[PDB]
Amino acid sequence: SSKTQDLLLLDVAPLSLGIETAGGVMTKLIPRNSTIPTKKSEIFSTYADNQPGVLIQVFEGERAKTKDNNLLGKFELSGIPPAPRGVPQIEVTFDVDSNGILNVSAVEKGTGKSNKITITNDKGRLSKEDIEKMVAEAEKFKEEDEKESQRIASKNQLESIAYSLKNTISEAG
């Protein structure tokens, strides 16, 4: 029931809020320990040409790989003019207000479309265990997870459609 109610100390983001980028790369916009309100806007590009829209899948957590991240929700902005990967500029704004409600707005600068979703910190999104897990795991594999992001490099992307493919055979490395 948390929208005009409280939870103990929602001043800072308990985990980093961001998106998944194609490949299982977690792109962080609002970091943990960052005191809200905080609105972060970045212009992302979709890694696909002839796209009909973009999908913004919101993930929370500290991992480099989105599989250890919490899925908050997603919204599909459909009806974007089919064009090359980086022709439509989609500015994805994570606007987290003081109540900890994450409003993710995606604004497409090419045609001028905009779509936003209201993701509130209300559900058993994380348990107290989950929060500590994601924090601890990223700290635990502090070298590995940062190298993941750095070796993959491909982040700050948007997907036109949910690819939903990993194909983890021998996983990765």
UniProtKB/Swiss-Prot annotation:
Chief localization: cytoplasm
Phosphoserine sites (modified residues): 170
Protein name, entry field: Heat shock protein SSA1
One GO CC annotation: plasma membrane
Subcellular location: Cytoplasm; Secreted, Cell wall
One of the GO biological process terms: negative regulation of DNA-templated transcription
Keywords recorded for this protein, A-Z: Acetylation, ATP-binding, Cell wall, Cytoplasm, Isopeptide bond, Nucleotide-binding, Phosphoprotein, Secreted, Stress response, Ubl conjugation
Additional comment: Present with 269000 molecules/cell in log phase SD medium.
Subunit organization: Binds human HTN3/histatin-5, a peptide from saliva, and mediates its fungicidal activity. Interacts with polyadenylate-binding protein PAB1 and Hsp70 chaperone SSA1 on translating ribosomes. Interacts with NAP1.
GO-annotated molecular function: ATP binding; ATP hydrolysis activity; ATP-dependent protein folding chaperone; heat shock protein binding; protein folding chaperone; tRNA binding; unfolded protein binding
Family that this chain belongs to: Belongs to the heat shock protein 70 family.
Residue runs in coiled coils: none
Residues of the full protein shown: 382 to 554 of 642
Function text: May play a role in the transport of polypeptides both across the mitochondrial membranes and into the endoplasmic reticulum. A functional difference between SSA1 and SSA2 proteins is expected. SSA1 can participate in the ATP-dependent disassembly of clathrin-coated vesicles.
Organism, scientific name: Saccharomyces cerevisiae (strain ATCC 204508 / S288c) (Baker's yeast)
